[PDB]
Scaffold this active site. Structure first.
Site, PDB file in Angstrom:
ATOM      1  N   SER A  28       0.951  -1.193  -0.109  1.00 26.55           N
ATOM      2  CA  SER A  28       0.019   0.100  -0.006  1.00 26.55           C
ATOM      3  C   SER A  28       0.904   1.145   0.045  1.00 26.55           C
ATOM      4  CB  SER A  28      -0.986   0.022   1.042  1.00 26.55           C
ATOM      5  OG  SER A  28      -2.224   0.817   0.805  1.00 26.55           O
ATOM      6  N   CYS A  85     -18.371  -3.384  18.461  1.00 29.03           N
ATOM      7  CA  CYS A  85     -17.899  -1.758  18.455  1.00 29.03           C
ATOM      8  C   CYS A  85     -18.745  -0.618  19.098  1.00 29.03           C
ATOM      9  CB  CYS A  85     -17.750  -1.158  17.111  1.00 29.03           C
ATOM     10  SG  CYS A  85     -16.077  -1.802  16.131  1.00 29.03           S
ATOM     11  N   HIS A 124     -19.657   6.334  15.519  1.00 33.11           N
ATOM     12  CA  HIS A 124     -18.369   5.431  15.711  1.00 33.11           C
ATOM     13  C   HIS A 124     -17.243   5.752  14.337  1.00 33.11           C
ATOM     14  CE1 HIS A 124     -15.824   1.886  16.694  1.00 33.11           C
ATOM     15  NE2 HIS A 124     -16.067   1.707  15.264  1.00 33.11           N
ATOM     16  N   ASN A 169      -9.619   3.477  14.191  1.00 38.30           N
ATOM     17  CA  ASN A 169     -10.699   2.488  14.744  1.00 38.30           C
ATOM     18  C   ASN A 169     -10.214   1.922  16.207  1.00 38.30           C
ATOM     19  OD1 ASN A 169     -12.670   0.917  15.660  1.00 38.30           O
ATOM     20  ND2 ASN A 169     -13.758   1.192  13.653  1.00 38.30           N
ATOM     21  N   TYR A 180     -21.430   1.533  15.870  1.00 39.18           N
ATOM     22  CA  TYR A 180     -21.590   0.275  15.011  1.00 39.18           C
ATOM     23  C   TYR A 180     -20.145  -0.623  14.824  1.00 39.18           C
ATOM     24  CZ  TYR A 180     -19.855   3.533  11.487  1.00 39.18           C
ATOM     25  OH  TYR A 180     -19.183   4.517  10.587  1.00 39.18           O
ATOM     26  N   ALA A 196     -18.681  -4.928  15.267  1.00 38.83           N
ATOM     27  CA  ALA A 196     -18.696  -6.339  15.342  1.00 38.83           C
ATOM     28  C   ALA A 196     -20.286  -7.055  16.012  1.00 38.83           C
ATOM     29  CB  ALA A 196     -17.652  -6.894  16.077  1.00 38.83           C
TER      30      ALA A 196
HETATM   31  C1  LIG Z   1     -11.057  -4.012   1.109  1.00 40.11           C
HETATM   32  C2  LIG Z   1     -10.937  -2.112   0.845  1.00 40.11           C
HETATM   33  C3  LIG Z   1      -9.711  -1.592   1.323  1.00 40.11           C
HETATM   34  C4  LIG Z   1     -10.913  -2.209  -0.818  1.00 40.11           C
HETATM   35  O1  LIG Z   1      -9.917  -3.127  -1.406  1.00 40.11           O
HETATM   36  P1  LIG Z   1     -10.472  -4.219  -2.706  1.00 40.11           P
HETATM   37  O2  LIG Z   1     -10.600  -3.391  -3.764  1.00 40.11           O
HETATM   38  O3  LIG Z   1     -11.844  -4.613  -2.054  1.00 40.11           O
HETATM   39  O4  LIG Z   1      -9.517  -5.296  -2.438  1.00 40.11           O
HETATM   40  P2  LIG Z   1      -9.483  -6.374  -3.888  1.00 40.11           P
HETATM   41  O5  LIG Z   1      -8.836  -7.788  -3.135  1.00 40.11           O
HETATM   42  O6  LIG Z   1     -10.779  -6.769  -4.497  1.00 40.11           O
HETATM   43  O7  LIG Z   1      -8.541  -5.682  -4.815  1.00 40.11           O
HETATM   44  C5  LIG Z   1      -8.847  -4.838  -5.726  1.00 40.11           C
HETATM   45  C6  LIG Z   1      -7.804  -4.024  -6.288  1.00 40.11           C
HETATM   46  O8  LIG Z   1      -7.316  -3.248  -5.223  1.00 40.11           O
HETATM   47  C7  LIG Z   1      -5.854  -2.886  -5.422  1.00 40.11           C
HETATM   48  N1  LIG Z   1      -5.235  -2.458  -4.294  1.00 40.11           N
HETATM   49  C8  LIG Z   1      -4.127  -1.806  -4.174  1.00 40.11           C
HETATM   50  N2  LIG Z   1      -3.959  -1.621  -2.927  1.00 40.11           N
HETATM   51  C9  LIG Z   1      -4.688  -1.933  -2.055  1.00 40.11           C
HETATM   52  C10 LIG Z   1      -4.905  -2.095  -0.641  1.00 40.11           C
HETATM   53  N3  LIG Z   1      -4.010  -1.601   0.037  1.00 40.11           N
HETATM   54  N4  LIG Z   1      -5.963  -3.017  -0.168  1.00 40.11           N
HETATM   55  C11 LIG Z   1      -6.637  -3.270  -1.047  1.00 40.11           C
HETATM   56  N5  LIG Z   1      -6.673  -3.379  -2.352  1.00 40.11           N
HETATM   57  C12 LIG Z   1      -5.617  -2.637  -2.913  1.00 40.11           C
HETATM   58  C13 LIG Z   1      -5.408  -4.546  -5.644  1.00 40.11           C
HETATM   59  O9  LIG Z   1      -4.243  -4.303  -6.344  1.00 40.11           O
HETATM   60  C14 LIG Z   1      -6.596  -4.646  -6.720  1.00 40.11           C
HETATM   61  O10 LIG Z   1      -6.191  -4.415  -8.056  1.00 40.11           O
HETATM   62  P3  LIG Z   1      -7.096  -3.873  -9.119  1.00 40.11           P
HETATM   63  O11 LIG Z   1      -7.924  -2.703  -8.724  1.00 40.11           O
HETATM   64  O12 LIG Z   1      -6.275  -3.410 -10.386  1.00 40.11           O
HETATM   65  O13 LIG Z   1      -7.899  -5.145  -9.666  1.00 40.11           O
HETATM   66  C15 LIG Z   1     -12.120  -1.380   1.297  1.00 40.11           C
HETATM   67  O14 LIG Z   1     -13.334  -2.254   1.443  1.00 40.11           O
HETATM   68  C16 LIG Z   1     -11.927  -0.476   2.265  1.00 40.11           C
HETATM   69  O15 LIG Z   1     -11.587   0.693   2.100  1.00 40.11           O
HETATM   70  N6  LIG Z   1     -12.001  -0.918   3.448  1.00 40.11           N
HETATM   71  C17 LIG Z   1     -11.819  -0.214   5.093  1.00 40.11           C
HETATM   72  C18 LIG Z   1     -12.971   0.780   4.950  1.00 40.11           C
HETATM   73  C19 LIG Z   1     -14.222   0.231   5.337  1.00 40.11           C
HETATM   74  O16 LIG Z   1     -14.924  -0.366   4.718  1.00 40.11           O
HETATM   75  N7  LIG Z   1     -14.541   0.319   6.689  1.00 40.11           N
HETATM   76  C20 LIG Z   1     -15.719  -0.322   7.432  1.00 40.11           C
HETATM   77  C21 LIG Z   1     -14.829  -0.895   8.666  1.00 40.11           C
HETATM   78  S1  LIG Z   1     -15.739  -1.222  10.083  1.00 40.11           S
HETATM   79  S1  LIG Z   2     -15.955  -3.770  16.030  1.00 41.53           S
HETATM   80  C1  LIG Z   2     -14.297  -4.488  16.075  1.00 41.53           C
HETATM   81  C2  LIG Z   2     -14.386  -5.673  17.122  1.00 41.53           C
HETATM   82  C3  LIG Z   2     -12.955  -6.631  17.018  1.00 41.53           C
HETATM   83  C4  LIG Z   2     -12.426  -6.492  18.511  1.00 41.53           C
HETATM   84  C5  LIG Z   2     -10.836  -7.183  18.335  1.00 41.53           C
HETATM   85  C6  LIG Z   2     -10.763  -8.593  18.780  1.00 41.53           C
HETATM   86  C7  LIG Z   2     -11.571  -9.585  18.056  1.00 41.53           C
HETATM   87  C8  LIG Z   2     -10.563 -11.016  18.136  1.00 41.53           C
HETATM   88  C9  LIG Z   2      -9.560 -10.937  17.058  1.00 41.53           C
HETATM   89  C10 LIG Z   2      -8.394 -11.804  17.538  1.00 41.53           C
END
Ligand SMILES: CC(C)(COP(=O)(O)OP(=O)(O)OC[C@H]1O[C@@H](n2cnc3c(N)ncnc32)[C@H](O)[C@@H]1OP(=O)(O)O)[C@@H](O)C(=O)NCCC(=O)NCCS
Ligand SMILES: *SCCCCCCCCCC
Ligand SMILES: *SCCCCCCCCCC
Lengths: 334, 334
Positions: free
Chosen positions: B38, B122, B258, B289, B319, B321
């Site tokens: 990343s 959470c 949250h 978080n 919001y 787990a």
């Molecule tokens: C998962 C998340 C990180 C996005 O990743 P994603 O695109 O679904 O990951 P994938 O495995 O499908 O890979 C897709 C692409 O992302 C790219 N990518 C680059 N850096 C990345 C990274 N650090 N993490 C994930 N994907 C990455 C991959 O190379 C891949 O290539 P492409 O776009 O050329 O096809 C996204 O859901 C996110 O922002 N999550 C945290 C925010 C959130 O939703 N929070 C709620 C938490 S309670």
């Molecule tokens: S909403 C996020 C709650 C997750 C708590 C972390 C601990 C869960 C067990 C991971 C080993």
């Protein structure tokens, strides 16, 4: 300059019903003791335990909890639809997250109701019952499920000649809801932090996780320290519960103390000055110390036998790990 | 005959104060990207996290929780003596038993006061505020410390390109007690057990303990599912929180969702139809978080930065787990 509304719920709440679940596998003292060095007699006379129930491999505190709820609901004459909330109290849900509560809710059919896990050692149930009555009176729920559940089996060290014969498995839930007359008295609770390690997991999960080669974590109990504490302190805790309920010891119908040790609970009965005929919970003889699930299970056993009857004025006293304690006076369910 | 007596307490309660503890060690975005593919820009845009705090090795949910409570107690102008109960609400207490709440109470010098641990992913803090107020109104307690604490660092799989940058460490406590005017609206909460596995521990501790040398558990997250969930469901959740409080959307001065992800929260802001100038908690920027610690840590950030004002009308939405949400309207503390 702008008011937050002040609301209220129903003022009278009681234990509508109880529902129990005990795993099918029966584990005698002979089975338990043959893997250490002891005897049937030796265990029976120091603790009160004869046989105990251990859960199957695919069972969890959540699964057993689900089955317990279903029965309480059945006994309360209600469906999942009638429930606004569930409190799963337990010390043996083996995931940091997600909490057991919503899972228990989903299994019942009421996928979206409020719910949380509550941890206060053996006295969890006491705090959960407590928390539910306060939430219903506050007007945040009309009817609730509170479940004590436990799978202590996998935590026991079979080579531990102090406690391997103590802990056991099971679940049991109560339906807490509005009643014509007040069914649950004010919570009486407290604790003793200096003595936290009296009942403990010997090694934290992450320390265990980072050093796999070391010993794995097991439950550890300091008998004399916990005997002394409960035996000589819970009497007054018992008196406060009745003090808050405006009830005299001569009027207690059923005594449900946590089933940790028959000798402890024997001493508490003399101490509390009850009627000579007051029905003392003794579910420990064939259940063991099921921790947070002891009192509700114990209530159902007294109910099952007939020794207790719906409406009997009961003293519930819980004591255990963390050194926590939570007592209330209640009317008998079903 | 013989009626069970009821107690009653303060009709209006509120957040007298907020105390916050964040560990000194900053962990930067570049630092996270050592064991994953990343960059800083990629993390910040998709989450809103720049840096976060990781706890020291001798620290824990309890140690941190304790520090936060003092800070709260000092802000409210009170000592341990003024507290009647403590609720620790966490998902990173690495002991099945004893609960952290007693040890925390002991640490403050309130050895014998009541308390327990509350687990609801959470949304833990939401429920714990809700239970705290409910208890105080029911007269089982007049003044309480509710502390949300979390040490997630050790649960993070540093190879998890999906979440290794999401979770962080810290604690925050509030003091609930009587106030001249209503300060916390009813609690609105609920769950989704079907999606219990969106945020999880992937392997329970027992399974792992019987196979120590194999894969160890870490926290898992199904990104899209939780985004999708929160982004379109917390709108009506919050709406319900303002409805019970008898306040309109235009009346909320401080929104504190949250701290899951800034994108989710901006969509909430829009959905909730808040004033253009309403103040929005974005503590995630240098805290990431912290699960059950987030909301009260957020409250503290806004107050510290003078972005929020004591008594400002606030909306809190938790919001995470289990798929659990708790939300209420309150007046701002400190
Ligand atoms: C998962 C998340 C990180 C996005 O990743 P994603 O695109 O679904 O990951 P994938 O495995 O499908 O890979 C897709 C692409 O992302 C790219 N990518 C680059 N850096 C990345 C990274 N650090 N993490 C994930 N994907 C990455 C991959 O190379 C891949 O290539 P492409 O776009 O050329 O096809 C996204 O859901 C996110 O922002 N999550 C945290 C925010 C959130 O939703 N929070 C709620 C938490 S309670
Ligand atoms: S909403 C996020 C709650 C997750 C708590 C972390 C601990 C869960 C067990 C991971 C080993
Ligand atoms: S009051 C007794 C409750 C026992 C809870 C201990 C859980 C097992 C810990 C060892 C893993």
């Amino acid at each position: 300059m702008t008011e937050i509304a002040t609301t209220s719920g129903a003022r009278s709440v009681g234990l509508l019903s109880v529902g129990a679940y005990r795993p099918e596998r029966v584990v005698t003292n002979d089975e338990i003791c043959q893997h250490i060095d002891s005897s049937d007699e030796w265990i029976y006379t120091r603790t009160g335990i004869k046989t105990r129930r251990f859960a199957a491999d695919d069972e969890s505190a959540a699964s057993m909890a689900t089955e317990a709820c279903r029965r309480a609901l059945s006994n309360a004459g209600l469906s999942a639809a009638d429930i606004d909330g569930v409190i799963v109290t337990t010390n043996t849900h083996f995931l940091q997250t997600p909490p057991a509560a919503p899972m228990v809710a989903a299994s019942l059919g009421a996928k979206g109701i409020l719910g949380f896990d509550l941890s206060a050692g053996c006295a969890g149930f006491g705090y959960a019952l407590g928390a539910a009555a306060d939430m219903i009176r506050g007007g945040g729920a009309a009817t609730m499920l509170v479940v004590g559940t436990e799978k202590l089996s996998p935590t026991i060290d079979m080579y531990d000649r102090g406690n391997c014969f103590i802990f056991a498995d099971g679940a049991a839930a109560v339906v807490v809801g509005e009643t014509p007359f007040q069914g649950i008295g004010p919570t009486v609770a407290g604790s003793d932090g200096e003595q936290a390690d009296a009942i403990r997991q010997d090694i934290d999960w992450i320390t265990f996780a980072q050093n796999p080669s070391g010993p794995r974590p097991f439950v550890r109990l300091e008998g004399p320290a916990v005997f002394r504490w409960a035996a000589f302190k819970m009497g007054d805790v018992g008196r406060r519960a009745m003090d808050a309920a405006g009830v005299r010891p001569d009027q207690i119908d059923v005594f449900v103390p946590h089933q940790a040790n028959s000798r402890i609970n024997e001493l508490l009965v003399k101490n509390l000055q009850l009627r000579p005929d007051a029905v003392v919970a003794n579910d420990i003889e064939h259940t063991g110390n099921t921790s947070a699930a002891s009192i509700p299970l114990a209530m159902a056993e007294l109910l099952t036998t007939g020794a207790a009857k719906p409406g009997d004025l009961a003293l519930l006293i819980g004591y255990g790990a963390g050194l926590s304690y939570a007592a209330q006076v209640v009317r008998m369910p079903k």
